[PDB]
Symmetry: C3
Subunit: 210 residues, 3 copies
């Protein structure tokens, strides 16, 4: 738990964390430490210092910036609130190759991976993930802790509910609203609104029941 | 109608205009004014000065560069001809993140959005839209006023007819020709030539009649 | 066969070569000559000097760097071995717009086109093609001489066998293994492992027999 001052604490030490670490370093930021539910190491050279019980120690030692690198959307949302309760500020991890329009509103704790484009007047909720190569056209609204998977695309005016997940290569046509907690499978093409809490797959995407 | 000299006039004041405005500003250009069929405001800080009846006034006051920011392909084509009749030059609106190969032939009034790649020896007709994240591989031929939607992709040697439209995430395999005025739905995967004036949807794309 | 010293020899003079030539020139490299099975010209200003029988002459004259610009995966693999037997080093042709993470392991003779992203801890075999706009998420393993077509995407932890081919816009969900010599059609969405030597198409991708 000997750290250098000033850097970013990461919650989570998986594959998603690797990619976030490399976005932060590409921006010139320093990653100080990881906390992981397996407290046993290092991720890309960043030390795993403990589990979430190490958060107060990290804060006391002067570290105050944090990113939640956990793919699971509800868990990420809960951990972001825990981190803020412990006095951390949630940074954004935006790869320098991402194109984020100057009229985009960004929340906090947002991941925006390499190759992303986000166009005019889009709003991006806290703790959203806009993954590698994803496209978000103008006037979209992305709720807190949703996840646009790699190579997915939203055409204009699409709203994505809190904690919704779009799989790799999913597509949404203009004006569509997708409910909270909804999953679009990989490659699904969404051509009408989706309610909350369903799973939709196919071209066109169709809701799959039990 | 008090303007600064030297900038670009925009026909259209919708969501597409927002994105074009931001491409032009990312290149260091100034947008002078919008003309919109609803002559009532501002779009991203650009004043709406009137409807298309204001074109001659704008030209007389020394403005001579124009972009047609209208998604509808036939309407865009008609408005580009009107603009040229009124003595405007049609500029291109190419986001600085777009990769346009040095052997690409570009027309005039072309939009090329953020994250696009256009490879060797492709030809891009006047008033085409190559939207956000779209890929155009080598040796493609894009007719005037066609529209490759966001995240769409053409493999090599594909020809797209005048005013054809490919929806978000559409794909075309090598060597395919798509007729004029044809629509490929979002996510459609085109594996054989399409004639003029049809609608094709699905993986693989199939023509949908009445 | 009068050449300038120091540049890259290209095997193949087709559409793929055009794109590779332009990646190399975008990096400031000089392309010295093409050898093509049709020994009859120039490709983008690069002289065709002969067929593969000209390799020893080229080496003797001091040229030692080579790229194999042949789309056919098995043929490319064979030609890369021939080139190395003749004393050439196989360079990589990585467009400057590609984002290649600093923990990616790259082989030799690899093409990485414009707009590609390759994330943390991915390994890319010799003579792989990562084509225009393709995305490779973290922890992927790409075998020698495979081809990820334009706008394709691998989510995390995907393994692609030697000489496998993914068509334009193909998608693979996390953790999937695709066998050697397997073809995924354009737009195919792979949701379970694929054995060697099959063809799979559709959303979801399904193996197509005779
Ligand atoms: C749709 C999904 C959520 C289903 O997971 P699951 O319910 O465990 O489903 P299974 O793998 O057991 O397959 C269920 C059935 O749906 C089909 N299926 C699975 N995923 C599909 C998809 N994306 N599109 C269409 N059909 C799909 C399967 O072929 C199977 O069909 P069957 O009835 O013929 O066997 C999942 O396959 C998916 O697409 N995940 C995306 C994950 C992702 O992209 N992650 C990126 C993280 S960065
Ligand atoms: C294909 C499209 C043009 C059809 O529009 P429409 O004819 O008004 O069709 P509807 O929304 O009434 O739906 C018609 C039927 O086709 C199906 N469908 C619609 N779009 C589909 C698509 N892209 N792929 C496959 N099926 C589709 C619907 O499920 C419906 O099926 P049903 O017979 O089971 O009800 C449209 O859905 C589309 O894909 N638009 C793309 C727009 C776009 O990407 N814009 C980006 C601008 S930058
Ligand atoms: C799948 C593929 C390999 C099949 O080639 P092929 O076996 O010669 O097939 P054909 O063109 O004769 O069509 C065979 C059948 O499969 C269907 N089909 C073809 N390609 C398909 C695809 N990608 N997805 C779903 N169905 C497809 C056809 O509609 C036809 O169906 P039918 O039985 O109703 O006629 C090919 O179409 C493909 O997708 N190629 C991708 C090439 C590419 O992306 N290259 C980029 C290089 S950089
Ligand atoms: C967006 C990505 O999300 C998922 O990636 P991921 O990195 O979140 O998932 P995994 O690789 O399983 O790693 C999650 C890591 O997160 C840790 N973890 C799991 N729960 C906790 C927790 O409560 N607190 C802390 N501090 N860490 C936790 C696990 O011990 C594990 O090391 C996967 O679904 C990927 O496919 C996807 N690309
Ligand atoms: C490429 C894009 O095309 C479409 O976007 P768009 O910006 O063209 O569409 P809208 O948002 O409806 O806006 C069109 C604007 O264009 C104006 N307009 C419509 N017709 C005219 C016209 O004849 N002359 C002028 N000067 N303006 C015209 C309308 O009054 C409206 O303000 C949509 O289909 C989008 O989903 C798509 N991304
Ligand atoms: C990745 C790309 O692969 C394929 O492109 P390609 O450039 O390899 O294919 P083609 O345009 O037919 O050109 C292949 C060139 O490669 C030459 N060639 C074919 N065989 C040989 C060879 O053994 N030695 C040499 N030196 N050259 C060979 C042919 O004479 C021809 O000029 C196509 O499938 C494209 O659609 C795809 N984008
Ligand atoms: Cl660091
Ligand atoms: Cl301006
Ligand atoms: Cl050169
Ligand atoms: Na892209």
């Amino acid at each position: 738990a000997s750290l250098a001052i000033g850097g970013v604490v990461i919650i989570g030490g998986g594959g998603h964390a690797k990619v976030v670490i490399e976005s932060l370093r590409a921006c010139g930021e320093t990653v100080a430490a990881i906390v992981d539910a397996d407290p046993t190491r290092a991720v890309l050279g960043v030390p795993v210092v403990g589990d979430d019980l190490a958060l107060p120690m990290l804060r006391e030692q002067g570290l105050s910036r944090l990113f939640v690198a956990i793919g699971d959307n509800r868990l990420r949302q809960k951990l972001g609130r825990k981190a803020r309760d412990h006095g951390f500020s949630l940074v954004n991890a935006i790869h320098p190759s991402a194109v984020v329009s100057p009229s985009v509103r960004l929340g906090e704790g947002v991941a925006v991976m390499a190759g992303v484009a986000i166009n005019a007047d889009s709003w991006i909720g806290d703790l959203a993930i806009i993954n590698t190569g994803a496209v978000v056209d103008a006037d979209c609204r992305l709720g807190a802790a949703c996840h646009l998977g790699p190579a997915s695309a939203l055409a204009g005016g699409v709203s994505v509910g809190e904690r919704a997940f779009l799989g790799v290569g999913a597509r949404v046509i203009p004006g569509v609203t997708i409910g909270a907690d909804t999953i679009v499978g990989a490659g699904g093409v969404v051509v009408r609104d989706l309610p909350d809490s369903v799973l939709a797959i196919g071209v066109p995407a169709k809701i799959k029941g039990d």
